[PDB]
Design a protein around this ligand. Sequence first.
Ligand SMILES: [Zn+2]
Ligand SMILES: [Zn+2]
Ligand SMILES: [Zn+2]
Ligand SMILES: [Zn+2]
Ligand SMILES: [Zn+2]
Ligand SMILES: [Zn+2]
Ligand SMILES: [Zn+2]
Lengths: 399, 136, 399, 399
Amino acid sequence: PVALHCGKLFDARSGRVLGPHTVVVRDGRIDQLISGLAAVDLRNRTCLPGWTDLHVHLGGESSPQSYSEGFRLDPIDFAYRSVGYAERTLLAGFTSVRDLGGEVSPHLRDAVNQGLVKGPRIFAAGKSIATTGGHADPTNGWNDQLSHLIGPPGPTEGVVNSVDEARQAVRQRYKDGSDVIKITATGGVLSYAKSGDAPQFTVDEVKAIVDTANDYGYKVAAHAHGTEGMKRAILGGVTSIEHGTYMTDEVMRLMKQHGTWYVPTISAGRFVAEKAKIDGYFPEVVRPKAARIGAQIQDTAAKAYRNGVKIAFGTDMGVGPHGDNAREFIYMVEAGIPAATALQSATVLAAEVLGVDDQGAIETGKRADIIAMPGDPVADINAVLNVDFVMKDGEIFRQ
Amino acid sequence: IATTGGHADPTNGWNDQLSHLIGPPGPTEGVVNSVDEARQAVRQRYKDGSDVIKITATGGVLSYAKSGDAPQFTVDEVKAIVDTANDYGYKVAAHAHGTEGMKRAILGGVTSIEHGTYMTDEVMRLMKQHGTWYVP
Amino acid sequence: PVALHCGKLFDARSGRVLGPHTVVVRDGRIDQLISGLAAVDLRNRTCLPGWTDLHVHLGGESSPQSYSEGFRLDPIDFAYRSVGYAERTLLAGFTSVRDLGGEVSPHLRDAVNQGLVKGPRIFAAGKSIATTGGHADPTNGWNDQLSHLIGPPGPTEGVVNSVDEARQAVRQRYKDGSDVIKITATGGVLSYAKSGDAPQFTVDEVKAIVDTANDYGYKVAAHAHGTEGMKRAILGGVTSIEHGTYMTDEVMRLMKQHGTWYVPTISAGRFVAEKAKIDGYFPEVVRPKAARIGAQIQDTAAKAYRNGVKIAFGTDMGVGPHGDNAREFIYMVEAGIPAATALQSATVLAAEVLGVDDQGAIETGKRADIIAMPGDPVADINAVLNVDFVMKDGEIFRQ
Amino acid sequence: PVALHCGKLFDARSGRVLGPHTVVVRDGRIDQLISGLAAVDLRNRTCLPGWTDLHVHLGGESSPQSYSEGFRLDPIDFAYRSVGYAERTLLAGFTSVRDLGGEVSPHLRDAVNQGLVKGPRIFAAGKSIATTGGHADPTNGWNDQLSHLIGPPGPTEGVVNSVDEARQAVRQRYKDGSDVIKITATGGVLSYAKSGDAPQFTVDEVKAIVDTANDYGYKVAAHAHGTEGMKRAILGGVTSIEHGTYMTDEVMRLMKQHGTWYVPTISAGRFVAEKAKIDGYFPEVVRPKAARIGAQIQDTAAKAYRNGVKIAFGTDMGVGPHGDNAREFIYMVEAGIPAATALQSATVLAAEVLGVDDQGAIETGKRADIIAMPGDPVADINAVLNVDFVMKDGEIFRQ
Ligand SMILES: [Zn+2]
Ligand SMILES: [Zn+2]
Ligand SMILES: [Zn+2]
Ligand SMILES: [Zn+2]
Ligand SMILES: [Zn+2]
Ligand SMILES: [Zn+2]
Ligand SMILES: [Zn+2]
């Protein structure tokens, strides 16, 4: 039981900054919202709900050695790194995240929920589902000896080639304890493969995945760069698109007609664009794709906002360093999206994307996830980089 | 007979080492994911010397799994199981708790329902129209 | 930067031999074509674009021991032989080839592209796709012990039996780094199997392979001898037919209506026809098929040319000795095809078959692949056997 | 660079508490020891070197569910628990430990050394070496199906049955990155086996293990309860004995003649003795062995101290709760060992057992591992439970 006294409160639903308020928290939820017992003095701060990042990979981080550590390290070492990754992410103001790939995050989520380590609320996808040779095929780039020893991946490993295999793959993700489904509709940048925008899913496989996920209560997020794969994913019925690098007008019309969410992840594009200039950082099969794709992301986000496409907050953390998730707000504002809309995309629109109704705004009966900063983020978006108060589930982690 | 991760999947709750050692279950072990696999599973039950067929249409209580009433069978797989069992002279009993899985089992043509915890009025109408038996 | 002065130039697009010309090459492309700085004196020669062979197997060569070396040798020895094969092929005037089978050619192509060894520009198919017991099944003729040890081949090994398996096989060819797809629609001559013209593919499997290849940007070449398999391949939508031994009038009508290319490979038929007369050269299961099929190739080519079927240049090297690819011109001319048309089928029509637009003719902006011979090949087709100048990518390999 | 001012200093080598001293620490080592710049005020505390626990298992902790979690959990979850275990152990005053079993501790040691997580200096044994059906056989108690699926363990898994297999097992421990060797000479209490004191090693296998370890620079610690196995381990040449529950006079004579160290681990015996009274806590095969063995440990320690056997500090943490390692001092003092000797057994005698010379005492040139408590531990041994200052490698973790 703690009473919070803060000078300004940001109303996520309305998008306006109000005046002084008092928030009473008992049992981990918001109970009273008096406008105009333990006490915390935040009268020189602005009150905001906790932020949600809809695209992170807490199981790793990009490095010059990232393409050779896989054959030498074990997932235990990656878990030991993920401890610090999760702590840094939580302390930056992000009280919940959506993990879209990696088999260490279901375990990190369990550890955080049991209180063993500090972190945000994790919605984990587990293994991503791809086709043979696809962006998420786990044996791309292996030699003949290793490939023969491991064998060809199947639905248990996340590689599908037909409707029945897609059904079995979704059921295996359910068996492994996932909260959300992730597929790679097209090729990517960071994979050890040749193509980066070619369509790698048929519409019948996407429809089968979506139907199976709807039976089990899941939502589907699709990774896409090319136009044809993006259109196939949209027509199959996916919930959100994770990249839209080559979005055309016909794709935007389909997204508006279907109600598909768009997650730009500008930070990853900028990071790969700058890292491609360095010599030797990326493998020679990866470098051209990065240098070509990373530069066509911010203009796409501006065009999508101008055309009326619904936009949600995501950074593709992992490619970039964990703990710097709030610079995406600055990128969004410099891409033409207003500061209030950019803030809303990470609180209430993110809750709509996740499919939950117990978070996203400071309202009675909702989870007590509250952050504070000395400045006013609407007037100056640069204030999002100075967060000094963090509260998750009624427990204070930073003051 | 169940589906992957279903109420009767024999490797639910096992760790990675044991799961890799045993491998993923298939129709021989009672885990099906398509029409042909359902046919093969019924034929394997006949080969092992069974007198009756049992499927888990939904999740359950005693399994080491998260859900307990979600629909885990498609109507096409239930129809395939029922047709194959009718060829070999078997009857089909279905375990169900949730409404959707119970309705899919009834529309597929099962003989009896083993639990009806969340039976609604529409389910009772379908049971009366089809003649399905109820075992509480 | 080198200027080429040659007495006569063959214009591939028009099919006529022109007079004196000067070709300026900088950065590996053709820049100027002055009609009427380093200099090469070719004023007593005829200028031609580099030739393309659309059907070779650079990973081996036929021999009396070819049916027993497979169980005793490794692909490394075949690579050491392929070094000489590729050098001999390049020095004969063939600056590009299309490899239609063998798992050593994707590696030879990489080595040639990196400059480690000398050779032409290779478009490799990788493993050919067949059905169980088909012409390209890798375990035909094995005993029970070896068959049980290896197991039954599947889509990863190139053996398909359904639509989904065909999709997975094309995706596996993409994963292994192929440039083109090859299937065996019917039986063949050199396989350790009984039939040699029976239809071994259903039209639904061919349609699935073609659709999957179109998704990934590939073209499909089909090996066929019998009429029914050839018709199924044509109706499925393949790009070219690799043999047409029993082509009927209805097949020619379908090829003309669809626009299918025809590659006769007369050299292989002649070679097997002569080798079948020798006793013990071929296994007793292979000898009748060779002796029956090798004699029905030249008449088919003449009939196809008379009926208006589009014809492209290919030799099926490997069956014959590498380095003698230019005798196919003589065979084509003696089959009734004019010398100019025979020369065009290997330069511009071959580029159309390959699907590229940066080669095939001596025009500004195209790759600098140039060959020269003392005689005039149009007046006397026998001049193609004396090539003394070879240029590939602006680099001179023979003078 | 920090100067430490503390009222009393315990000299580990002499065993006496001196007066005021000033310790200067630069670069992580002790540089000056002025008797009679950043400053830390400890003038109301007693200065001691950091403690070493020679027998811990940081990869787990005993619980009512410990005999069923193995089939359901993965080592990643145990690593997430080990993070808290290691932090609690470090904060209690133990700056170094010797881990004598478990495959999570080599990874935890790497993570602590890289600074990812907080913990003490870990000397890890990796997998313990046993014989078929021995105390450390990893498949004891498994059913027929699981045993057939995993196969029979060999030297790679730590199970040996001959001289050559023992050599290979020691070499495999070296390959996995171990710092010390651990064998189970007899049966134990916590294993899912029938016997608990029967000799399970021949003297020839012990001699082979010791010779191989001497080649690679390792020391050998042996787990033993029965007399015959303990005598075989001593005659084989092991460095220390981990339990001595049934030590006779002839065994003590052999230990004194050879110079073998003795680690009693009284805490584990007391813990199992009390837990055996609870119904259902232990499996029915484990309960009689625990109830019989746990009560015969303190008298053995008293007799060993009376007879002149060298004694070193160890607790067998894991069986008991991590963080309560300092109660072993109280047990040792109540067993008749003087407080000064009990304190020395964990600082300088522990360094002798470990085989290092850069720690164990507050002397110039040694590692800066310093702890402090308000009371005087020699006058009152109960003061060891209140540690408020911890320093490891010159870095302060508690003040
Ligand atoms: Zn992505
Ligand atoms: Zn991503
Ligand atoms: Zn039941
Ligand atoms: Zn052929
Ligand atoms: Zn061929
Ligand atoms: Zn022990
Ligand atoms: Zn122990």
